[PDB]
């Protein structure tokens, strides 16, 4: 007997922001999740996420990051959970040998972002704790920083519920029935209908979009993150150790200063195990790689951070072939909105994406172009 204006399937990073957008406008909204978000089975746990603005992956990302950033400052104001801490973000790599660093430096120049440029010994003088060869260069964004992604979800959820959004937890959606006039979901806990549907199931999008007759290659990856006891006089946020995303010989790594004395957190970005989200092994340390790829970085470039392993999390990316997101209406149903394929770099945009989703759902359009996220683009395959 339960008919909603909008149903959101998957109330994680994207879905919970979308639900908050909709509920804020008095849209009667049901959010359905396989768990009880924020949880540790998806792509949003491990405590912290980088947001940075000098986004070389495409010009369209730059305004989405800056809008997202403003929206995270707004969410900070609205809630008692902590959202954002402005640690700055350091990008470094070997000079002339890093398309990532080069593209980062261009987007900054091209969008007039405020940034510092440094190189070689300057990097280690500015942040003791960093040890790079004298041939490395860097670009520091002083105004970006670190999101607390689980708090962001919890905040969006509390605020959506306050305005009347319903969240059906521990309920896996199993199928979809889409008419021109409604949408329907089927679950072990019952069926629900609405005018509009947003689909944002994170890694499970790779198995479940076929239920909507779509065939999009989406590869989920096993991505671990470890938290290490650290020299606080070098890696503490309080001494301006930055968040970072850097390129070295064996690939790209990301990480976070120590907050509250808890330990530097680090992740290896360019490698992960190909997995299925239902059979992923979420134990940190089951492959020797989990800890060794991270120590290999630490001992070379951040040796005072290479302490006892305090904790590891196992999390998931869901890549498209072009590593761009998919944000678009279903091509055969204008009442179904798809958010998928965030490719290991979506969380920072999740506030802005929630806004864009809520617009697609309510109007079939959004205020700025979004064509690089087209579900009909050919490089998706
Ligand atoms: C280790 C790691 C570090 C990262 N670091 C960064 C970073 O520093 N900066 C950054 O921008 N991004 C980062 N990312 C990526 C970012 O976290 C993801 O791109 C983003 O969270 C994707 O959000 P989502 O809503 O698609 O998925 P999720 O937040 O996982 O949400 C999808 C939801 O769908 C639910 N669901 C699944 N199946 C069903 C079903 N059948 N029925 C109902 N519900 C279902 C799941 O329970 C889940 O809650 C990182 C990711 C990882 C794994
Ligand atoms: Cl992802």
**For the residues of 325-369, what is the DSSP string, one character each?**
-EEEEETTEEEEEEEE--TT--GGGHHHHHHHHHHHHHHS--SS-
Return the residue matching tokens 């730059």. 62
- E-strand ranges in 160-284 read 166-168, 173-178, 183-187, 190-199, 219-228, 243-248, 251-256, 264-268, 273-274
Distance 299 CA to ligand 1 centre (A): 30
CA-closest residue to ligand 1 atom 48: 12
Residue 316 Cβ < 6 Å to ligand 1: yes
From CA 241, how far away is CA 23, in angstroms rounded?
A: 38
From CA 41, how far away is CA 276, in angstroms rounded?
A: 12
Phi, psi of 150 (to 5 degrees): -70, -40
Ligand 1 atom having least distance to the Cα of 344:
15
Residue 347 Cβ < 6 Å to ligand 1: yes
Residue of 42, 89, 349 with the most ligand 1 atoms within 8 Å of its CB, for mutation = 42
Neighbouring CB atoms inside 10 A of 249's CB total: 8
Residue 341 Cβ < 6 Å to ligand 1: no
Ligand 1 atom having least distance to the Cα of 46:
1
In a 3-state reduction of DSSP, which class is residue 17?
A: helix
Residue 208 Cβ < 6 Å to ligand 1: yes
Distance 52 CA to ligand 1 centre (A): 18
Ligand 1 atom having least distance to the Cα of 267:
1
Phi, psi of 208 (to 5 degrees): -115, -10
Smallest CA-to-CA distance from 37 within 17, 15, 14, 12 is with 12
Residue 344 Cβ < 6 Å to ligand 1: yes
- Residues in Cβ contact with 214 at an 8 Å cutoff, skipping those fewer than 6 apart: 330, 338, 375
Residue of 7, 8, 9, 10 with the most ligand 1 atoms within 8 Å of its CB, for mutation = 10
Annotated binding site: 5-35
Strands 333-340 and 326-330: antiparallel
The verdict on whether omega for the bond into residue 38 sits within 30 degrees of 0, i.e. cis, is: yes
Residue 315 Cβ < 6 Å to ligand 1: yes
From CA 160, how far away is CA 23, in angstroms rounded?
A: 6
Ligand closest in space to the Cα of 205: 1
Strands 3-9 and 190-199: parallel
Ligand 1 atom having least distance to the Cα of 174:
41
Method: X-ray
Distance 215 CA to ligand 2 centre (A): 18
From CA 47, how far away is CA 44, in angstroms rounded?
A: 8
Q: Are 341 and 325 in contact (CB under 8 A)?
A: yes
Residue 223 Cβ < 6 Å to ligand 1: yes
Distance 118 CA to ligand 2 centre (A): 30
Smallest CA-to-CA distance from 254 within 243, 263, 265, 245 is with 245
Strands 273-274 and 309-319: unpaired
Distance 275 CA to ligand 2 centre (A): 13
Q: Are 13 and 347 in contact (CB under 8 A)?
A: yes
- Residues in Cβ contact with 267 at an 8 Å cutoff, skipping those fewer than 6 apart: 46, 223, 224, 225, 226, 253, 254, 255, 294
Cα–Cα separations (whole angstroms), residue 48 to 82, 97, 153: 11, 28, 12
List domains and CATH numbers for the chain: 1-59+149-212+326-381 (3.50.50.60), 60-145+213-321 (3.30.9.10)
Smallest CA-to-CA distance from 38 within 17, 60, 69 is with 17
């Amino acid at each position: 007997s339960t008919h909603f204006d909008v149903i959101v399937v998957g109330a994680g990073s994207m879905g919970m922001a979308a639900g908050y957008q909709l509920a804020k406008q008095g849209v009667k909204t049901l959010l359905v999740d396989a768990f009880d978000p924020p949880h540790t089975n998806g792509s949003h746990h491990g405590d912290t996420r980088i947001i940075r603005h000098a986004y070389g992956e495409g010009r369209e990302y730059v305004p989405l990051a800056l809008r997202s950033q403003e929206l995270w400052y707004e969410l900070e104001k609205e809630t008692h959970h902590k959202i954002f801490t402005k640690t700055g973000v350091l990008v470094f790599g070997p000079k002339g040998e890093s398309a990532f660093v080069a593209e980062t430096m261009e987007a900054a120049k091209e969008h007039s972002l405020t940034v510092d440029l440094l190189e070689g010994d300057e990097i280690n003088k500015r942040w003791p704790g960093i040890t790079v060869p004298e041939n490395y260069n860097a670009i520091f964004e002083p105004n970006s920083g670190v999101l607390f992604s689980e708090n962001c979800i919890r905040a969006y959820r509390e605020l959506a519920e306050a305005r009347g959004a319903k969240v059906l937890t521990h309920t896996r959606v199993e199928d979809f029935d889409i008419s021109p006039d409604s949408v329907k979901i089927e679950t072990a806990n019952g069926s629900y209908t609405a005018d509009k549907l947003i689909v944002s199931m994170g890694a499970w999008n790779s198995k479940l979009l076929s239920k909507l007759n779509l065939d999009i290659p989406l590869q989920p990856y096993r991505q671990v993150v470890g938290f290490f006891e650290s020299d606080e006089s070098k890696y503490s946020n309080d001494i301006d150790f930055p968040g970072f995303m850097v390129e070295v010989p064996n690939g790209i790594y990301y990480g976070f200063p120590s907050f509250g004395g808890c330990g530097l957190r680090l992740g290896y970005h360019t490698f992960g195990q190909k997995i299925d989200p239902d059979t992923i092994n979420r134990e940190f340390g089951v492959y020797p790689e989990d800890e060794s790829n991270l120590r290999a970085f630490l001992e070379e470039y951040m040796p005072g951070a290479n302490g006892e392993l305090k904790r590891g999390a196992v999390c998931m990316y869901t890549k498209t072939l072009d590593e761009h997101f998919i944000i678009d209406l279903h091509p055969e149903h204008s009442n179904v909105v798809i958010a998928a394929g965030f490719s290991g770099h979506g969380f920072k945009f999740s506030s802005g994406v929630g806004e864009v989703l809520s617009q697609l759902a309510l109007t079939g359009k959004t205020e700025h172009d979004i064509s690089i996220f087209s579900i009909n683009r050919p490089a998706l395959k």
